[PDB]
Amino acid sequence: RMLFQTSYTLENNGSVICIPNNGQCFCLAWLKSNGTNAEKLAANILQWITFALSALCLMFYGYCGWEEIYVATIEMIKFIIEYFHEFDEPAVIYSSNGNKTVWLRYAEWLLTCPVILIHLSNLTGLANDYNKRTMGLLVSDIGTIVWGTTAALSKGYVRVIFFLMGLCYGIYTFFNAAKVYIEAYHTVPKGRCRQVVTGMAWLFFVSWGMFPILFILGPEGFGVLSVYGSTVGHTIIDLMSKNCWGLLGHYLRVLIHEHILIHGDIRKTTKLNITEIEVETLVEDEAEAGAVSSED
Amino acid sequence: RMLFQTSYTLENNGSVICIPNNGQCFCLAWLKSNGTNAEKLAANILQWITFALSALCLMFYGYCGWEEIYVATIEMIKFIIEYFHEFDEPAVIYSSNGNKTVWLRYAEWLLTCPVILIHLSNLTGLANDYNKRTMGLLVSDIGTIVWGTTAALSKGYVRVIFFLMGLCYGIYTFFNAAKVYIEAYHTVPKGRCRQVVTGMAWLFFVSWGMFPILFILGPEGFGVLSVYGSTVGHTIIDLMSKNCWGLLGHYLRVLIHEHILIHGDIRKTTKLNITEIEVETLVEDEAEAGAVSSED
Numbered sequence A, B: 001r002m003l004f005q006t007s008y009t010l011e012n013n014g015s016v017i018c019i020p021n022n023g024q025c026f027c028l029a030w031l032k033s034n035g036t037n038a039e040k041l042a043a044n045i046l047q048w049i050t051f052a053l054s055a056l057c058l059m060f061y062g063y064c065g066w067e068e069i070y071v072a073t074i075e076m077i078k079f080i081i082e083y084f085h086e087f088d089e090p091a092v093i094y095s096s097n098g099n100k101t102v103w104l105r106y107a108e109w110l111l112t113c114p115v116i117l118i119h120l121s122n123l124t125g126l127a128n129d130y131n132k133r134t135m136g137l138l139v140s141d142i143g144t145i146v147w148g149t150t151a152a153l154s155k156g157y158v159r160v161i162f163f164l165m166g167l168c169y170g171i172y173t174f175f176n177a178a179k180v181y182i183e184a185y186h187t188v189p190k191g192r193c194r195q196v197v198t199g200m201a202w203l204f205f206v207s208w209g210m211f212p213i214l215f216i217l218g219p220e221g222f223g224v225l226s227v228y229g230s231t232v233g234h235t236i237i238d239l240m241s242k243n244c245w246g247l248l249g250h251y252l253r254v255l256i257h258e259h260i261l262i263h264g265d266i267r268k269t270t271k272l273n274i275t276e277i278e279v280e281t282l283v284e285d286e287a288e289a290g291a292v293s294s295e296d
C-alpha cells in the first residue's frame, strides 16, 4: 500500500541503498513494523466498539448540550478516517529524523480541548458566564498539547526539554481542574448529582493522567509500546475520556435542569477553605438559603 | 549543516540514486532552495527588529496585564530558537510526501490563541467574567488552526478539504470577533479609548485576514512564495498581530483603569441592534447612567 519508497536494493555489501529516482521520500525508519497481527486485531475490534458507542451517544443526544455532541461528532469523523487512512500521511507524519507522529490523535485533542474545558467550567449547565480560572485552564492545556506535540516531533535532549515544558503547563492545568471539581461538588444538590460529579472527577483525572504515561511508553518516548499496542491503549482511555465522560456530563446536566423543574433554583452560600473560596449550593429545600462556611 | 542525507550519487543515467546506508532519511524535495540571499538578508533584519520590539515591550510591561507580556514572552523564546535552529526539525518538519511544514509558526499560534482570544474578550480589563460567545470563539479558532495545520501537512484534494474546513470555522470566528469589537466600542468612554479600540479592530482583522492569504501563497498552498519570502511576510504581520496589538491593548487598559481613578465606574445601558444586544457604557459624567437604545 505505501506512498513513500518501499522498494530498494542493497549495494557494496549493504553500505549503499539504491532506489528508483521517482521523487518519492525514503527512510528505512518508516518501514519498521507497527506490531503483531494480534495487536492489530485487538485494535480493530476496540475501534468498531468505539464507532458503535460514538454512534449511539450521538443519536441519544438527539432527543445547552453542544459540548457532548461535538466530542461524539469529532469521534465519528475520526473513525471514518481511521477506517480509510489510519497509517496514511497525515494521520501519521513520517518525518526526516525517522519519527512516526500520530497527528490524528493530537489534532482531535486540540479540536475538542476548548469544548471539554468549557464543559469542565459548566458541569451543571446553569452558568451563562465563566470566571478567570476557566481562561487559565484553556491557556495552560493548549500549551501542554503544543509542547507535547513538539516533543513527539523531536529527538534526544530537545524531546526531553519540550516534554518537561508540557509537564510544567500540565501540572498548572491539573491543580486548577481539581479546584473546579471541588466547587462543582459543593454547588450541585446533595443526592445523585454529587455521585455523578464524583464519577466525572475519577474518569477525568485517570483518563487525562494516562496520556503523558502512554506518551513516555510509546514510539514518541522510550518505544516500550508498538504502534498497535499504543492504539489499543488509546482506544481504552479514548472511550473513558470522550464517550463515557460526555455521557456522564449529559446525565448530570439532565438531573440539574430537572431539579429546577421540580424544586426550582434555590442557591446557598457554602464558603469553602480547601484558601477562601465561595459557592452557590443548589438545595431541594426552600428554607435552606443561607451562608454555610464549611472550612475544609 | 543538514541532519538528513544531503550527499548522493546518480546511477543508471539518473534513474537510481545511491546513498550511504547510515540510517538518515532522504528526499530530494527537502533540498529545494529556501530562496535568494537577498530574501534571506531581508528576513534576518526584520527578525532582529522583531527581537528588539519583543524585548522593549516586555521591559515596558514590567513597570491584569498577563495576556500582553505572555505574547511578548513567547515571541522572545521564538527569536532565540529562530537564531539557533530556524530550519532544523522540528522548527521545520521535513515529511515523507516531501512537504516542509513550519511547525514553529503553528505552535506559537496554538500557544497564544487562548491568550489573545481571552484578551479579545477583555479589552477594558474591567470584566472578571466571560460570556458564552468567548467560548465559541476559542473552539472555532482552535479548529481553524488544527484543520489548517492538517492542510499544510497534506497534498492534493486532502489539503483542499482541510483548508475548506479551516475556512468554515474561521468565518464563524471572524463573524463573532466583529460583534465583540462592536460591544467594546460602545462600552468604553467616548474620547481616546474609542480611537484605540478602532485601532485594535483594524490591526486584528487585517493581520488575522493575512494569515490564510499567506498560506495559499506559500509552499503550503500554490508555492508562489519561497520560504524566505514567506518569512519576510510573516515578520511584517507578526509585528502587527503580536507586539503592536498587545502594546495598543496595554495602552487601552491603562486609559480605562485611569478613568476609574478619576471619574469612577459610571456605567450606562446602550441597547444596540446591529439583533437585540445590550452594553454597559462607561461615561465621564455621573448624571449619565440610563438606558440609551441606539438601534444600529
Ligand SMILES: *[C@@H]1O[C@H](CO)[C@@H](O[C@@H]2O[C@H](CO)[C@@H](O)[C@H](O)[C@H]2NC(C)=O)[C@H](O)[C@H]1NC(C)=O
Pocket: A013
Ligand atoms: C559485509 O558486511 C557484513 C556485515 O554483516 C560483514 O559480515 C560480518 O563481518 C563482521 C566482521 O567485521 C562480523 O563481526 C560479523 O559476525 C559478520 N557476519 C554477520 C552475519 O554479521 C562482512 O564481513 C562484510 N564484507 C566485506 C567484504 O566487507
Ligand SMILES: *[C@@H]1O[C@H](CO)[C@@H](O[C@@H]2O[C@H](CO)[C@@H](O)[C@H](O)[C@H]2NC(C)=O)[C@H](O)[C@H]1NC(C)=O
Pocket: B013
Ligand atoms: C539519459 O537520460 C537523459 C534525460 O535527460 C537523456 O537525455 C535526453 O534525451 C531525451 C530523449 O529521450 C531528450 O528529450 C532530451 O532532449 C535529452 N537531453 C537532455 C539534456 O535532456 C538520455 O538520452 C538518456 N540516456 C539513455 C541511454 O537512456
Ligand SMILES: CCCCCCCC/C=C/CCCCCCCC(=O)OC[C@H](O)CO
Pocket: A155, A156, A157, A159, A160, A163, A164, A167, A174, A209, A212, A213, A216, A220, A221, A222, A223
Ligand atoms: C499529576 C499527575 C501525575 C502524572 C504526570 C506524568 C509524569 C510522568 C513524567 C515522567 C518523567 C520522566 C521524563 C520524561 C522525558 C520524556 C522524554 C523522552 O522520552 O526522551 C526520549 C529519549 O531520550 C529517547 O528514547
Ligand SMILES: CCCCCCCC/C=C/CCCCCCCC(=O)OC[C@H](O)CO
Pocket: B155, B156, B157, B159, B160, B163, B164, B167, B174, B209, B212, B213, B216, B220, B221, B222, B223
Ligand atoms: C473574511 C475574511 C476574508 C479572507 C479569507 C481567506 C479566504 C481565501 C480562500 C481562497 C479559496 C481558494 C481555495 C483554497 C484551497 C487551498 C488548497 C491548496 O492550496 O491546494 C493545493 C494545490 O492543490 C496544490 O498546489
Ligand SMILES: *C\C=C(C)/C=C/C=C(C)/C=C/C1=C(C)CCCC1(C)C
Pocket: A108, A109, A112, A116, A144, A145, A146, A147, A148, A149, A163, A166, A167, A170, A208, A209, A211, A212, A215, A241, A242
Ligand atoms: C480526546 C480527549 C482527550 C481528553 C485528550 C487528552 C490529552 C491529554 C490530556 C494530553 C496530555 C499531555 C500531557 C499532560 C503532557 C505530555 C504531552 C501530552 C500532550 C501527551
Ligand SMILES: *C\C=C(C)/C=C/C=C(C)/C=C/C1=C(C)CCCC1(C)C
Pocket: B108, B109, B112, B116, B144, B145, B146, B147, B148, B149, B163, B166, B167, B170, B208, B209, B211, B212, B215, B241, B242
Ligand atoms: C501569533 C499570532 C497570531 C494572531 C496568529 C494567527 C493565525 C491565524 C489567524 C491563522 C488563520 C488560518 C485561517 C483563517 C484558515 C487557514 C489556516 C490558518 C491557520 C492559516
